[PDB]
Design a protein around this ligand. Structure first.
Ligand SMILES: C[S@@+](CC[C@H](N)C(=O)[O-])C[C@H]1O[C@@H](n2cnc3c(N)ncnc32)[C@H](O)[C@@H]1O
Ligand SMILES: C[S@@+](CC[C@H](N)C(=O)[O-])C[C@H]1O[C@@H](n2cnc3c(N)ncnc32)[C@H](O)[C@@H]1O
Ligand SMILES: CN(C)c1nc(=O)n(-c2cccnc2)c2cc(Cl)ccc12
Ligand SMILES: CN(C)c1nc(=O)n(-c2cccnc2)c2cc(Cl)ccc12
Ligand SMILES: [Cl-]
Ligand SMILES: [Cl-]
Lengths: 380, 380
């Protein structure tokens, strides 16, 4: 019954993640002034460049240069020695209003509760009782390794660190009637951008002793655990200079690390009417409510929409064999307890609040008791 | 045992898909001259603009203006009345060489068979016996609906059609010990860009009679099937003008339509050393080989890598209950029959061949007998 499973995560300065965080900084800036802003902000990053491209209709007055540069500053790209600098990079803007054809079909002259979905699409929610926060251990550990690197960079413990990083964790699990039980960590990868002066051995020793041991419980690590630390051997060039980044290119890091499923939609840079985000958050809320409600140990929820239509077109449940109730019965419980119209999700999950930049690194789920992480008490 | 499942697809002129096709036109142009080109070409599309951003090291001499414009011409954006024109759009290039830090850690001075993975990451392959081509019926039908729209546009049957389209199909399935059996089509969505003169009723009638009936077998359609045809009511503005597109924003349309799983990596614009593409193609090849070999009715394969390391870090199998063999036994059969080092996959799947633009619309799998679609005869 033993098997392996692998998940990855990336740091705040990974170029795709920079784009997600800037897209969400833009969204938050609009929502602080206009809770009903319609935002579809894509970000592209390459050497010396942040480009914003997309569609925004809003009553807010947003200074894009300031918002972009402040987000890059927070990430830590503040000097040409690091490969990118918020003070001196190019910020280019290609933003137009939302298509009036989309606006008239989705929200114009619609009662909020009855607003149409902002697009068609499919979305999934997942939860697993293997951790208290109901997330896969593989991705929780991968996120925490990136967070630890940023913590040691910011407190000056390891001043050779730069903001761009990636981690990957392979866990060996056992299973019991579809539930999964972590046994040990089989393999860890860490790659992180660094300065020109630190040597490989110093970095590898610090990554094992100050990063991995500070995050992964010793009970999961043994003589057979495989460590791939700075496996490329050199990572001085990094950030957008090493690799072009785009918004919505880390959708699996944003969600379940390979577990569960994904409908394809990106979260960052989108207001609640874009069901790629709101319905995925609601589906996480449903899945976590079923697991914390004791109805199943693990569960996957699919939902889908048509542009301009409020009610979902389909809802489906997969319990991996971890419920005594059938998937049909669980689906009936979901339909009796949840209303997944976007105009209802916005109220239940408070989705006009400008907390989106906080979601754009380290995963959107299993952290900070955001509304979609607080289970709903189920009646049946 | 009945349940619903939904998948979507998009047309060649969907703005994200335009980007994938241009990224792969660039890759093919390089591979036609330099089979060993290192390509990481992202594309961004917004009103009047194609931007190329990324990293290419190649001995080829490529005329980016010609390659981009020819790809847009093929798609059908050839006039300002359609919202985008290959003859007159802006083509901007932000392409640099591959990072020397990546090159030295991945491939420089390495025997080809022993080249390192071009990045860390996780990838999945999936196959299902529900169709001859071993793909989910939901996504096969969704792709064929987009192909039919492009066919009727190009042959002048429905001259009001434009290249930007989306479709979505919900199938009602039965199940038998983990295998899935399609029963009927529950809901179909079609949204397609159109000219200013055609009315909604004309479009809805043509979509049902000339598109859906020409693709979906009548046995799946009944009095209860729900049709959402042009549900937004108006879609004159389209393509990049209606919505900014980016490479690698249709990764679920490119693969299994929500079924199976995804590791997060985008395919288009990348040469074989980027395991996001090559290892996902090899994992599809493994999954299809297990199903066509009669070992299981449905199967999921995970693989993972570390940058600079040739052998995968992990391989895992999930058979959904559709094999008499355990997942451990199937994994042993996979390890005895396949070598998933990128420098071996390139040879088995002929991945230096410039056929990538052909993969960049209508899904990378279940079509055209590409090498990853030809099962390997298994020994055990
Ligand atoms: C390996 S790059 C993708 C391939 C790249 N576009 C190329 O031209 O080969 C993906 C991510 O890996 C990380 N990376 C960049 N340079 C690296 C290096 N020298 N060693 C390890 N990881 C690196 C960064 O997080 C980057 O965004
Ligand atoms: C609905 S748009 C995404 C949201 C958009 N960025 C916004 O500003 O609201 C996603 C895709 O839907 C399609 N689309 C564009 N305009 C549409 C319309 N008026 N009706 C239906 N689908 C449309 C195109 O394929 C487009 O790429
Ligand atoms: C309990 N086991 C054995 C697994 N549980 C899962 O949920 N999935 C899985 C993950 C994502 C989508 N579909 C299924 C697995 C996937 C693989 Cl490749 C291997 C093992 C498992
Ligand atoms: C056989 N049935 C009942 C299903 N089979 C699947 O393979 N998955 C599935 C799809 C993707 C990832 N993990 C699992 C399902 C997912 C849902 Cl939400 C509902 C039903 C099924
Ligand atoms: Cl990456
Ligand atoms: Cl889209």
């Amino acid at each position: 019954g033993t098997f392996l499973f692998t998940s990855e995560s990336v740091g705040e300065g990974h170029p795709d993640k920079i784009c997600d965080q800037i897209s969400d900084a833009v969204l938050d800036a609009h929502l602080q002034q206009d809770p009903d802003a319609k935002v579809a902000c894509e970000t592209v990053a390459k050497t010396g460049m942040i480009l914003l491209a997309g569609e925004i209709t809003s009553r807010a007055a947003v200074d894009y240069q300031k918002v972009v540069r402040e987000a890059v500053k927070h990430i830590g790209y503040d000097d040409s020695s690091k490969g990118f600098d918020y003070k001196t990079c190019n910020v280019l803007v290609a933003l137009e209003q939302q298509s009036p054809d989309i606006a008239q079909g989705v929200h114009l002259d619609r009662n909020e509760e009855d607003i149409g979905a902002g697009d068609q699409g499919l979305m999934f929610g997942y939860a697993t009782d293997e951790t208290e926060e109901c997330m896969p251990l593989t991705i929780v550990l991968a996120h925490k390794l990136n967070a630890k690197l940023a913590e040691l960079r910011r407190n000056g413990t390891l001043p050779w660190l730069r903001p761009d990083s990636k981690t990957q964790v392979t866990v060996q699990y056992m299973q019991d009637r579809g539930a999964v039980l972590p046994i040990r960590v089989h393999t860890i990868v860490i790659s992180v951008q660094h300065d020109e002066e630190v040597c490989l051995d110093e970095m590898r020793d610090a990554l094992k002793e100050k990063v991995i041991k500070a995050v992964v419980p010793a009970k999961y690590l043994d003589e057979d655990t495989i460590y791939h630390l700075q496996p490329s051997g050199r990572f001085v060039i990094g950030g957008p200079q090493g690799d072009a980044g785009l918004t919505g290119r880390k959708i699996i890091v944003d969600t379940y690390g390979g577990w569960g499923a994904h409908g394809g939609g990106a979260f960052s840079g989108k207001d609640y009417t874009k069901v790629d985000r709101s319905a995925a958050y609601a589906a996480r809320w449903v899945a976590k409510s079923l697991v914390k409600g004791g109805l199943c140990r693990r569960v996957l929820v699919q939902v889908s929409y048509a542009i301009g239509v409020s009610h979902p077109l389909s809802i489906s449940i997969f319990h991996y064999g971890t419920s005594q109730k059938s998937e049909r019965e669980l689906l009936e419980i979901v339909k009796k307890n949840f209303d997944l119209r976007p105009g209802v999700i916005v109220r239940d999950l408070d989705l006009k609040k400008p907390i989106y930049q906080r979601t754009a690194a380290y995963g959107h789920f299993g952290r900070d008791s955001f509304p979609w992480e607080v289970p709903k008490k189920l009646k049946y």
